[PDB]
Structure 1
Amino acid sequence: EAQKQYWVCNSSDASISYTYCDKMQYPISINVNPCIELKGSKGLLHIFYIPRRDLKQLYFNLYITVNTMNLPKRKEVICRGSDDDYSFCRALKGETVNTTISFSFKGIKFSKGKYKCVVEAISGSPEEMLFCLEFVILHQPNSN
């Protein structure tokens, strides 16, 4: 069984897919509306997920790669303290997450080639990996 590839969406300037990295865990459904443009766009992220850890204190380690050039790690805490928190933050092992989240993507200019972002989802203190996803964002070869 060859490793399965997941497509999220194509925009006018990007083609977005991902695969599961590290240990294969519970699956995740990820949808983006409208599809992100590398040159910048905003929209809504829909997530359908049955988690195997509690989403409490969820953060991402982001490893971004720009045409094979690795950038230094980034951290972005998602679930922080008390409220101003997404409702899914209070989700527990086994409780369906079925939410939509707003996003704004500023965008890169002069974009070309291929980008990668590996998303290490860590949550549930005691802190263990929730999921790992490696996104591949192709720049459409026929668009700037």
Structure 2
Amino acid sequence: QKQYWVCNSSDASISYTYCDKMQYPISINVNPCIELKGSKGLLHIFYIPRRDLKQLYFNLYITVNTMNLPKRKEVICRGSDDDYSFCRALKGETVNTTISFSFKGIKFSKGKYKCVVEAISGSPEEMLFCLEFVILHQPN
């Protein structure tokens, strides 16, 4: 498997690889790099979906240095008149977008956090891609 690097901060080393048989390319950037201490920034994405990005959502499987957390379900855009403009896209339509984010207020232990991301969308609710992220964390 090939390793795709993203960014380094003072206390993080985000990276990712592909989950399943499908290996459709994707371009992800974050500016500035995420500090696992409370951060704020922009997330730029360039993609060409293989299904309609309609009622897209994410399944998140997180692991904290070999302890599993429960499965998370994040609904990105819902039904009709959604917050984001990119989720009216169709197959083969280029998506080229930027989303702002911010967070703070939780202490994390040192270790090797890992996250499997499963995107689900479409009318028959099939999967779009699966990525596996790896985050190393050494405070200071």
Tell me if TM exceeds 0.5: yes
Kindly state the Cα deviation for residue 129 of structure 1 after the two structures are TM-superposed.
0.7
How many positions carry a matched residue from both structures?
140
Give the CA deviation at 1:84. 4.0
> What are the superposed Cα offsets for residues 72-106 of structure 1, whole Å, 9 maximum, x if unpaired?
10000001132242111000000000000011233
Q: For residues 110-136 of structure 1, what are the alpha-carbon distances to aligned partners after superposition, in whole Å with 9 as ceiling and x for unaligned?
A: 431110111000111211110001100
- For the residue of structure 1 that corresponds to 2:86, the secondary structure is helix
Partners of 1:39 and 1:111 within 8 A in 2: no
Deviation at 1:33, TM superposition (A): 1.0
Stretch deviating more after TM superposition (109-118 or 94-103) = 109-118
Deviations 1:52-85 (A, max 9, x none): 0111100000001111111010000001132242
The whole-number CA distance in structure 1 between the counterparts of 2:68 and 2:95 is 32
Deviations 1:6-35 (A, max 9, x none): 011111110000001012232111111111
Q: After the TM superposition, which of the residue ranges 25-34 and 49-58 deviates more from structure 2?
A: 25-34
CA change 1:64–1:107 in 2 (3 A) is: farther
1:22 pairs with 20, 23, 36, which one?
20
CA distance in 1, matches of 2:105, 2:122: 31
Whole-angstrom CA distance in 2 between matches of 1:111 and 1:54: 38
Contact preservation (8 Å) 1:15, 1:137 = yes
**Secondary structure, counterpart of 1:114 in structure 2:** coil
Higher strand proportion (structure 1 or 2): 1
Unaligned 5+ residue runs, structure 2? none
Identity rate, percent: 100
CA RMSD, aligned part only? 1.4
Q: TM-score, normalised by structure 1?
A: 0.91
TM-score, normalised to structure 2, is: 0.93
Work out whether residues 38 and 111 of structure 1, in 8 Å CA contact, stay in contact via their aligned partners in 2. Answer: no
